[PDB]
Amino acid sequence: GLKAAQKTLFPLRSIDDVVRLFAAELGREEPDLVLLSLVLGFVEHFLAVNRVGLTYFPVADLSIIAALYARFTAQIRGAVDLSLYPREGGVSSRELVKKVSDVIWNSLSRSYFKDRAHIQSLFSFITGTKLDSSGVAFAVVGACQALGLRDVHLALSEDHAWVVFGPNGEQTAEVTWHGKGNEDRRGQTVNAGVAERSWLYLKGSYMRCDRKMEVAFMVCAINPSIDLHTDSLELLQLQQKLLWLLYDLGHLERYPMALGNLADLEELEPTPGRPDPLTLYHKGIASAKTYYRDEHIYPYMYLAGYHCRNRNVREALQAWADTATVIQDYNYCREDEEIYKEFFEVANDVIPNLLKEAASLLEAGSQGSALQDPECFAHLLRFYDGICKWEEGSPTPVLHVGWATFLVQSLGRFEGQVRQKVRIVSPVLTFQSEKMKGMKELLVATKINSSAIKLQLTAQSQVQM
Ligand SMILES: FCc1nnc(N2CCN(c3ncnc4sc(CC(F)(F)F)cc34)CC2)s1
């Protein structure tokens, strides 16, 4: 069960009391993932899922939390017999990790909506027998820690989760599902996905969590949403405070998305005497560059979205061009659909809306407009260049004529006299993709040749008779 020293802060009567509990666990050799997730899922359930009776904060009584902890630990200890899986050198075996994964999986409800909110925590596992995809992975890691398997840790990409374990922490194992329909490699390594250079496995530049970073994950996993138009202020505040705690302790150093999430919160409600959201976005980017070979897409997408929301068009374009410059060195593979959808929405909805507004504000006398800045046109072109390069040597195609219509529209937003100022070298820009190299003369012409652009972008061979 819980240690006497873990129980002394109960009952938890406020956000700050939950923060104190996290501070205490984080000061321990090994923070207790099961305890912490149970507390978070409890407080989340009574602040976002069922607010009936709420007066300030759902009090977390020790008797309630200890009973939940006991249900978890007994379920796992009862189902996983460790004597059957001998441990050399303080390291777990692939069979043991698979067993734990099987226990978690076989405990879940046969049928449910697998991307509902609030199914991420151990509280949900225990009270609802429901977990989302990365919730299963986290639950495997928490179950492993509860079994004393110190080597089993959470591994995270930008769209998937699995575990690492074994000698030197060098082994990988699939423990959960990914996406929709995708058919199990449960129990297998991730080395095939790494070898194929898909975004989903980050060319091996994925996060290998220590226990502190596992705490950070569960804090990022808090979901303040009450419905589509309403967030829990209490849960926002709790997540923000918990992320600052982690930050001050050093545990967001290797966690770009967490710094992004904290920047996003700070934009919504800034904490006096903290770094601005911009600074936090840039620390996320710096983290990706330092620890992950600058192979992450979301650090730039978080920046871009901030600049977008604030109508810093130039800086939004730049950051989306940087997103593309990351993606260009990946192969577009089957299970990377989420990042395709994001690039599709930026190219075909967000950019067009932004430039449409720019064009009206131009007509209204704007000065320093993105549409009169050749550097902005260059960013636009680099964005497409990365997408085209990504497409090169991918099994499936990325671009198609639906992209071409928006590209022509977006180019058309910039006058000839602006477009002709970008210097495309073999503002200065170098193209990496063959599509954009062959488009160069079309791009800087007075009248945009729409049909020729479409053929170049889509590699459509012929025009109709
Ligand atoms: F583009 C700007 C973004 N805004 N929100 C973004 N995300 C929301 C928060 N996200 C995350 N934030 C912290 N950690 C993780 S780990 C992970 C992969 C998973 F779910 F485990 F399989 C996702 C994710 C995912 C990306 S990106």
SS (H, E, C) the chain: CCCHHHHCCCCECCHHHHHHHHHHHHCCCCCCHHHHHHHHHHHHHHHHHCCCCCCCCCCECHHHHHHHHHHHHHHHHHHCCHHHCCCHHHCCCHHHHHHHHHHHHHCCCCCCCCCCCCCCCHHHHHHHCCCCHHHHHHHHHHHHHHCCCCCCEEEECCCCEEEEECHHHCEEECCCCCCCCCCCCCCCCCHHHHHCCCHHHHHHCCEECCHHHHHHHHHHCCCCEEECCEECHHHHHHHHHHHHHHHHHCCCCCCHHHHHHHHHHHHHCCCCCCCCHHHHHHHHHHHHHHHCCCCCCHHHHHHHHHHHHCCCHHHHHHHHHHHHHHHCCCCCCHHHHHHHHHHHHHHHHHHHHHHHHHHHHHHCCCCCCHHHCHHHHHHHHHHHHHHHHHHCCCCCCCCCHHHHHHHHHHHHCCCHHHHCCCEEECCEEECCCHHHHHHHHHHCCCCCCHHHHHHHHHCCCCCCC
Q: Count Cα neighbours of 102 within 13 Å in the Cβ-side half-sphere.
A: 10
Residues 87, 104: Cα–Cα separation, whole Å: 21
Residue type (1 letter), 306: Y
**Among 97, 255, 106, which Cα is nearest to 166's?**
97
Question: b/e for 390-412, b at 16 or more Cβ within 10 A?
Answer: bbeebeeebbeeebbebbbbbbe
Residues 346, 339: Cα–Cα separation, whole Å: 11
How many angstroms is the resolution?
1.8
Domain count along the chain: 1
User: Ligand 1, from 176, 257, 335: best to mutate by most atoms within 8 Å of Cβ?
Assistant: 257
Residue type (1 letter), 294: D
Please return the burial class of 360, using the count of CB atoms within 10 Å of its CB with bins 0-12, 13-18 and 19+: exposed
Bond before 275 cis per omega within 30 degrees: no
φ/ψ of residue 400, rounded to 5? -165, 175
Token digits for 276?
A: 């601005």
Distance of CA 318 from the midpoint of ligand 1 (Å): 21
Distance of CA 453 from the midpoint of ligand 1 (Å): 35
CA-to-CA separations, 4 to 27, 43, 75, in angstroms, rounded: 15, 22, 22
User: Ligand 1, from 213, 220, 242, 247: best to mutate by most atoms within 8 Å of Cβ?
Assistant: 220
**Among 226, 159, 298, which Cα is nearest to 306's?**
298
Cβ count within 10 A of residue 312: 16
Question: What is the residue range of 77's domain?
Answer: 1-465
Ligand 1 surroundings by CB, under 6 angstroms: 134, 156, 159-161, 217, 220, 257-258, 261, 298, 301-302, 305
Distance of CA 257 from the midpoint of ligand 1 (Å): 6
Cβ count within 10 A of residue 24: 15
User: Ligand 1, from 158, 201, 215: best to mutate by most atoms within 8 Å of Cβ?
Assistant: 158
User: Ligand 1, from 136, 247, 298, 303: best to mutate by most atoms within 8 Å of Cβ?
Assistant: 298
Close Cβ partners of 223 (under 8 Å, ≥ 6 residues apart): 44, 48, 117, 118, 120, 235
Distance of CA 222 from the midpoint of ligand 1 (Å): 12
Experimental method: X-ray
Please return the burial class of 196, using the count of CB atoms within 10 Å of its CB with bins 0-12, 13-18 and 19+: middle
Please return the burial class of 269, using the count of CB atoms within 10 Å of its CB with bins 0-12, 13-18 and 19+: exposed
Supply the residue whose CA is at minimum distance from atom 9 of ligand 1.
Answer: 257
Distance of CA 103 from the midpoint of ligand 1 (Å): 26
Supply the residue whose CA is at minimum distance from atom 4 of ligand 1.
Answer: 302
